[PDB]
């Protein structure tokens, strides 16, 4: 019941906040160390928010061979206790 319909990266707003609006309004360009906002859309209404939050993690990878030791891959949960 946690299917994903779409994810909006909000390229215009984030690029405005991250001083990359001159680059594009469609591609997400962000600068490290500063938060950016995305919107996750679900196919069905989410009944219980906390178990669903416990059920989801995010992974960011860069390069052809991403790994933790190279710091080219990070897996982090979606929670208010995350290291900002």
């Amino acid at each position: 019941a946690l299917g994903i319909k779409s994810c909006d990266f909000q390229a215009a707003r984030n690029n405005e906040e991250h001083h990359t609006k001159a680059l594009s309004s469609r591609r997400l360009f962000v600068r490290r160390g500063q938060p950016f906002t995305i919107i996750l859309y679900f196919r069905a209404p989410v009944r219980a928010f906390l178990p669903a939050l416990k059920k989801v993690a995010l992974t960011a990878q860069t390069g052809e061979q991403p790994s933790k030791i190279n710091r080219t891959q990070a897996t982090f949960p979606i929670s208010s206790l995350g290291d900002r």
């Binding site: 594009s24 309004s25 469609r26 591609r27």
Partner: protein, 145 residues
């Protein structure tokens, strides 16, 4: 007078639009003060959601066709031709990578090269139309290869 397409198809979208789809806007109008008809072709650097013209998908291409009343010039039909040209895969790909008007004109010539004209025939319509199936298939055997 009413357009032929309206008379034969109108007297009696977002679901079908693919997700990574970009819009082409064709603008057609008659201006009696212009000496000659003019064509404008615009490829935006990136697809844009023009606030003045809200479309189901962001606009990538703009066709502007303006001019006066001229012999053999139907501007609605001229816009229909430019729209069909955009709908064709090979010209659309050429339009995305075009860097000059000459490359666009070369693609239009190939579009005209692989175009079939059915003359006025007295045959039954279902036979006259279906007779184009093998001729068009042979004519497009290399265009989409």
């Amino acid at each position: 007078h009413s357009s032929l397409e309206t008379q034969l198809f109108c007297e009696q979208i977002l679901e079908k639009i693919p997700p990574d789809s970009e819009a082409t806007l064709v603008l057609v109008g008659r201006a009696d003060f212009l000496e000659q008809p003019v064509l404008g072709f615009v490829r935006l650097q990136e697809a844009a959601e023009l606030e003045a013209v809200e479309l189901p998908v962001p606009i990538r291409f703009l066709f502007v066709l303006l001019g006066p009343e001229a012999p053999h010039i139907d501007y609605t039909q001229l816009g229909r031709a430019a729209a069909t040209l955009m709908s064709e895969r090979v010209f659309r790909i050429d339009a995305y990578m075009a860097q000059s008007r000459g490359e666009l004109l070369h693609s239009l010539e190939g579009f005209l090269d692989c175009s079939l004209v059915l003359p006025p025939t007295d045959a039954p319509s279902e036979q006259a139309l279906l007779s184009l199936v093998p001729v068009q298939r042979e004519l497009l055997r290399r265009r989409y290869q």
